[PDB]
Amino acid sequence: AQVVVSSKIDTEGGVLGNIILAVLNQNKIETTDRIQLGATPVVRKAITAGEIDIYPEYTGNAAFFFSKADDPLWKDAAKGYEEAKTLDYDANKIVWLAPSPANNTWAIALRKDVADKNNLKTLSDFGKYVAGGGTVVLAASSEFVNSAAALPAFQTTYGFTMKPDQLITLSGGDTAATIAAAANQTNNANAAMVYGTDGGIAPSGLVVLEDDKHVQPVYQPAPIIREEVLKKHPNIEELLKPVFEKLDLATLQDLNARVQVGGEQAKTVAMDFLTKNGFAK
Ligand SMILES: [Cl-]
Numbered sequence: 001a002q003v004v005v006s007s008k009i010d011t012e013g014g015v016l017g018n019i020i021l022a023v024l025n026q027n028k029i030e031t032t033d034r035i036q037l038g039a040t041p042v043v044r045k046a047i048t049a050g051e052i053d054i055y056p057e058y059t060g061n062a063a064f065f066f067s068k069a070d071d072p073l074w075k076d077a078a079k080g081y082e083e084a085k086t087l088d089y090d091a092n093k094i095v096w097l098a099p100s101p102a103n104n105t106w107a108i109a110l111r112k113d114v115a116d117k118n119n120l121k122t123l124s125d126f127g128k129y130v131a132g133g134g135t136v137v138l139a140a141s142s143e144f145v146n147s148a149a150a151l152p153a154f155q156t157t158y159g160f161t162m163k164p165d166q167l168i169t170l171s172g173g174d175t176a177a178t179i180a181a182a183a184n185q186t187n188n189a190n191a192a193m194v195y196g197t198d199g200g201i202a203p204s205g206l207v208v209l210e211d212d213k214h215v216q217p218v219y220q221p222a223p224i225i226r227e228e229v230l231k232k233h234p235n236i237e238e239l240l241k242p243v244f245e246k247l248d249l250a251t252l253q254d255l256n257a258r259v260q261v262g263g264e265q266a267k268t269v270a271m272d273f274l275t276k277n278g279f280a281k
Helices: 011-026 040-048 059-065 077-092 112-117 123-131 142-146 151-158 175-184 227-232 236-245 249-260 266-276
Strands: 003-008 031-038 054-058 094-096 106-111 138-141 167-170 191-195 206-208 221-226
Touching: 003 011, 003 040, 011 031, 011 054, 011 221, 011 236, 011 249, 011 266, 031 040, 040 054, 054 059, 059 077, 077 094, 077 221, 094 227, 106 112, 106 123, 106 175, 112 206, 123 151, 138 142, 138 175, 142 151, 142 167, 167 175, 175 191, 175 206, 191 206, 221 227, 221 236, 227 236, 249 266
Parallel strands: 003 031, 003 054, 138 167, 138 191
Antiparallel strands: 054 221, 094 221, 106 191, 106 206
């Protein structure tokens, strides 16, 4: 029986799904390609119904699957991973394999020139800079500026507030527009609302600030696999471990950018990543 590989329909799903596919093929596990099948609900329905076997899911998404969206545990990367793994095994006999360290969550990215000049690496650094009178204009969605769990939470935890003249507020939630604003200094923008592994970040010369006090839930991608399929191919676990360990934030940003900015096929990007790191030939 072929192992059915899938993913969510977004760019990163295509990248991670093709990475899984290629690792399996290189290690002589035959596959069926159902990559980029649909949105999260469609892919969840498919794996629980046994229509797909393995795909990349994010730790923090388990908060929504298991009716725990309001639980603070998801903001702790290790706790979130363990809770996702335990619940999906107990409820669904789905096995979570080793995660990537990349946190693909709501974030603030700064222009690299501003970050370098002011030695800003973390949101704590950013709060100190803003509170002290540092020059900032942040491009963000109305939802990000106003929803309790977003900018307001960052402001409270990191000790800063943003004035109206320090914000470019857009109606929609697409980070394409906010990334571009900061990249181009539109209306003096030097910061953008992003998700951590957004492909646009790499070529736009922005850098994601670390959420060092853990305000946002953590979304680490990991391959997850139906137990019965893993039992048939038990080496899948160890084969994917070093591969996902190498997928740090900047590496994933770059791979995503190759697809969504460079126009490369995800299959090609995945194979190049594996060959470069000794996981394929
Ligand atoms: Cl990382």
